[PDB]
Amino acid sequence: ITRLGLDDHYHDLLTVSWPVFITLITGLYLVTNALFALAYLACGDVIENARPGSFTDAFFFSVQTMATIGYGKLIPIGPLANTLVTLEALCGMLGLAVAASLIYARFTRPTAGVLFSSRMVISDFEGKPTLMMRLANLRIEQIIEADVHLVLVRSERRFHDLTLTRSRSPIFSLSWTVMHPIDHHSPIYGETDETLRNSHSEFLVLFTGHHEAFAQNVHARHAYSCDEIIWGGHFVDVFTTLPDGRRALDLGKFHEIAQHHHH
Amino acid sequence: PRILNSDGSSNITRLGLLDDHYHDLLTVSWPVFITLITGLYLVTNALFALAYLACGDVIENARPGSFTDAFFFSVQTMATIGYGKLIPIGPLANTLVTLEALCGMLGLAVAASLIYARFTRPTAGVLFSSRMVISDFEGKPTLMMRLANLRIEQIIEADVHLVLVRSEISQEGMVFRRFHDLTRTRSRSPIFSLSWTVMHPIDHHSPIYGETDETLRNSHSEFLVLFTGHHEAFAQNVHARHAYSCDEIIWGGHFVDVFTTLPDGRRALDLGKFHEIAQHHHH
Ligand SMILES: [K+]
Ligand SMILES: [K+]
Ligand SMILES: [K+]
Ligand SMILES: [K+]
């Protein structure tokens, strides 16, 4: 949709692509050394072993000054240079820190290793026709206090928050089948493939939890369409018992769904 | 005189108040912060120059006794620039050179900690409607206000609070400001991206049931709005505040549909009319 309506720097800095970010920084960096060279130059021949007036001699000097490399070939002369050498060194620090702050922020974006089942199903469970889909954790580290939100979307556009058998799993480690008993209170009570489509119904799934791996929260999203609900489907058990009498988890069949056919 | 600024901020004059450093360091303005740091930095080199000087002529290629020669020296020492023209001499300088370098590190880290802290503040891009309304919806007179997300990145698990704040008298005849948490049709929106009209059905349970412009005003009633949610842009939480007065509720107002069709046949959200409110008039 067409939105009718610098200024938002911290956001843009984080949002912008990695390449763009590196440029914006290289730019700010090249530029400030360019201002510091114009300073050293503006004091007269204040740098030693730099050609008189030569901007490029003061640039490389300022670089190894803000950058504290300090080769020694080009040193400052007097109180003037030695005071732009003092401030400029402060700017390198102030410079670096902000960089690292942003570098840390954009970098430390943790991602849930969560895999969503490609389809949903509606089949009977505990007597009631129940809407189901399932999640699986792609990593070893466990997600504590996971919890899922199952939201229906349809035209009437309205959001309905579908009640779940289990809204939150205190320890999500392997797999988790989420379930919405369709009882007389379900927004989709007596609904049907046809009726569902007519309303343009979609399904939003929201996952979050604490990730032990990162020691921070994570979030995952996914959305299904009527198209993607298998009426009467049952998710294939994804847990085996190997030769060795041990239990195992086969994600190979994570999106497998069983169904019965006749005429 | 309003009790709560449009801000969310409370409009009230307080009274009767290195002691709170971490707070002040974060709170102070950016310019003041840079000064406080430039000050601490200039000062410590000034103490290290008085040290090198206090050992005798311990720096090479520095004029004897000259404080300024040891200042620059100490600068390029704490700062590790290391030109080399002025080097330390003996065990004394070379041991203030060892500690002073430790301080540059300890110095830089704290700086960065604070720099990171003050800098890493995400802001919700949320826009609050300038006014509220009370008009019929689904039969019931319903209190409404609306929010818009000024960015593209969506806010997930947004959720909103609508707080009445007004003066009441206890049964023991006692006047105080109470806050009421107004029940919303929708308290949370799982995905907030464009616009959102928040609604409090005024039913027989509403703290403002049967209330009216006049009665509202007598009680000094105000409305606090609190918004929070996860911002996909920052990958962190955000929060927004705002507050209205009775003055700012339009009875019988309806918010102008803010969803347009441009000349493309294309669907557009026009924030231009975000605070537009329609109203009937009499005689
Ligand atoms: K260095
Ligand atoms: K360094
Ligand atoms: K160096
Ligand atoms: K050197």
Side-chain angles (χ1 to χ4, degrees), chain A residues 1-6 8-243 245 248-262, chain B residues 1-17 20-104 106-139 141-156 158-173 175-235 237-261 263-265 268-283:
Chain A
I1 278 193
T2 309
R3 299 175 168 258
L4 315 166
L6 177 63
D8 185 358
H9 57 80
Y10 187 77
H11 161 282
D12 305 343
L13 286 162
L14 269 41
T15 303
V16 294
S17 68
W18 272 108
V20 149
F21 180 86
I22 290 177
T23 316
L24 283 169
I25 290 187
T26 320
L28 171 80
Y29 173 82
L30 292 179
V31 172
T32 60
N33 273 120
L35 295 161
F36 273 111
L38 290 180
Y40 299 112
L41 257 36
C43 300
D45 302 330
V46 272
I47 304 135
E48 195 177 319
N49 289 322
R51 292 170 289 181
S54 177
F55 157 91
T56 33
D57 267 327
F59 191 83
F60 293 128
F61 167 87
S62 162
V63 155
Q64 50 198 62
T65 292
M66 213 214 102
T68 71
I69 312 162
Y71 290 126
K73 227 288 206 184
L74 311 61
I75 34 172
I77 318 185
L80 302 177
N82 258 282
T83 302
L84 295 173
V85 163
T86 297
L87 285 206
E88 214 208 335
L90 195 48
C91 296
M93 144 132 68
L94 300 194
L96 178 64
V98 178
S101 286
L102 304 169
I103 295 143
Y104 171 91
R106 326 204 342 152
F107 205 64
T108 163
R109 300 283 186 97
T111 58
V114 174
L115 168 76
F116 296 83
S117 64
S118 70
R119 301 279 187 292
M120 301 189 183
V121 306
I122 299 199
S123 61
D124 307 351
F125 168 77
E126 308 259 70
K128 271 172 248 94
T130 217
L131 173 54
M132 280 169 285
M133 55 80 53
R134 69 167 170 198
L135 300 158
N137 167 5
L138 311 163
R139 301 151 169 161
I140 316 320
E141 300 83 9
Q142 324 210 334
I143 306 177
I144 69 154
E145 276 165 340
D147 95 18
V148 145
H149 224 95
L150 187 50
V151 163
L152 154 62
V153 204
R154 79 175 166 209
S155 318
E156 290 189 349
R157 286 285 261 180
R158 204 184 163 354
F159 287 56
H160 303 278
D161 194 357
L162 304 178
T163 287
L164 269 32
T165 284
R166 300 279 185 268
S167 173
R168 104 176 289 136
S169 158
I171 279 197
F172 174 57
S173 275
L174 302 170
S175 204
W176 176 10
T177 292
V178 167
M179 299 178 185
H180 166 95
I182 317 162
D183 60 8
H184 48 264
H185 288 134
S186 171
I188 79 179
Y189 186 66
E191 283 296 327
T192 91
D193 176 349
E194 206 218 347
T195 50
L196 268 187
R197 317 202 172 227
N198 297 333
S199 42
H200 264 283
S201 296
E202 277 178 341
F203 293 89
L204 200 73
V205 173
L206 310 158
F207 173 93
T208 78
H210 191 82
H211 209 297
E212 279 196 347
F214 310 80
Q216 284 182 351
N217 284 302
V218 293
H219 298 83
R221 235 141 30 94
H222 201 267
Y224 304 90
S225 60
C226 308
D227 233 357
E228 315 181 315
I229 305 170
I230 295 335
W231 301 74
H234 297 95
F235 279 114
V236 172
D237 185 353
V238 99
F239 291 99
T240 315
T241 300
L242 298 155
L249 165 65
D250 187 19
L251 290 167
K253 36 199 61 188
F254 186 76
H255 322 228
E256 279 187 40
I257 302 177
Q259 189 172 4
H260 304 251
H261 305 247
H262 209 311
Chain B
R2 42 196 322 156
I3 283 184
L4 281 178
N5 298 302
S6 178
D7 227 19
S9 140
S10 45
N11 168 39
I12 276 175
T13 74
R14 322 193 68 112
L15 281 174
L17 286 182
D20 185 357
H21 57 78
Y22 188 77
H23 162 280
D24 306 346
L25 290 163
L26 269 42
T27 298
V28 290
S29 63
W30 272 109
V32 150
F33 182 85
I34 289 175
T35 315
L36 283 168
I37 295 189
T38 317
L40 173 80
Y41 173 81
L42 293 182
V43 170
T44 60
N45 276 119
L47 295 163
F48 273 111
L50 287 181
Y52 300 111
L53 255 37
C55 305
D57 302 327
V58 273
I59 304 135
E60 183 178 2
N61 288 323
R63 294 171 286 180
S66 176
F67 160 90
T68 32
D69 264 327
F71 191 81
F72 295 127
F73 172 87
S74 158
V75 157
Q76 47 199 62
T77 293
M78 214 214 102
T80 67
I81 310 157
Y83 292 128
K85 163 69 145 140
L86 309 63
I87 34 171
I89 318 182
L92 300 176
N94 258 287
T95 302
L96 293 174
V97 164
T98 297
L99 288 202
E100 211 202 341
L102 197 47
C103 297
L106 299 191
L108 178 63
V110 180
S113 290
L114 304 172
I115 300 143
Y116 170 90
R118 326 202 342 152
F119 202 67
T120 162
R121 301 287 187 93
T123 63
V126 175
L127 172 76
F128 297 90
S129 64
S130 73
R131 298 277 181 295
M132 308 187 181
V133 306
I134 298 200
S135 64
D136 302 353
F137 168 78
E138 306 260 70
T142 224
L143 174 47
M144 286 169 286
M145 60 94 37
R146 69 171 172 193
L147 299 161
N149 169 1
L150 308 160
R151 296 153 175 160
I152 321 311
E153 299 84 13
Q154 340 201 314
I155 303 172
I156 64 152
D159 92 12
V160 139
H161 279 266
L162 201 34
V163 185
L164 179 67
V165 184
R166 75 177 163 191
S167 313
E168 311 185 336
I169 61 171
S170 55
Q171 153 191 330
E172 312 58 42
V175 310
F176 59 115
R177 304 281 291 165
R178 189 189 282 292
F179 54 91
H180 299 264
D181 197 355
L182 301 178
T183 285
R184 296 148 220 81
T185 281
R186 234 134 83 47
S187 174
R188 272 193 46 139
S189 147
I191 277 198
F192 174 56
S193 36
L194 301 170
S195 217
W196 177 9
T197 293
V198 167
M199 299 173 182
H200 167 98
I202 318 169
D203 57 14
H204 48 263
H205 285 135
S206 163
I208 78 179
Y209 186 59
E211 284 297 321
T212 91
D213 175 349
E214 203 220 348
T215 50
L216 268 185
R217 228 131 127 10
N218 298 330
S219 41
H220 262 283
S221 297
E222 277 181 343
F223 293 86
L224 201 74
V225 175
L226 169 76
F227 173 95
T228 74
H230 189 258
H231 210 299
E232 283 184 351
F234 308 80
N237 285 307
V238 296
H239 79 253
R241 273 154 38 220
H242 202 270
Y244 304 91
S245 63
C246 299
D247 233 358
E248 319 181 315
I249 306 172
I250 297 331
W251 302 73
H254 297 98
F255 277 113
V256 170
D257 187 352
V258 97
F259 291 99
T260 318
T261 333
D264 298 339
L269 162 67
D270 186 16
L271 291 167
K273 40 197 56 187
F274 188 75
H275 318 229
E276 274 190 48
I277 299 179
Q279 183 176 10
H280 173 268
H281 301 247
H282 317 270
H283 206 294

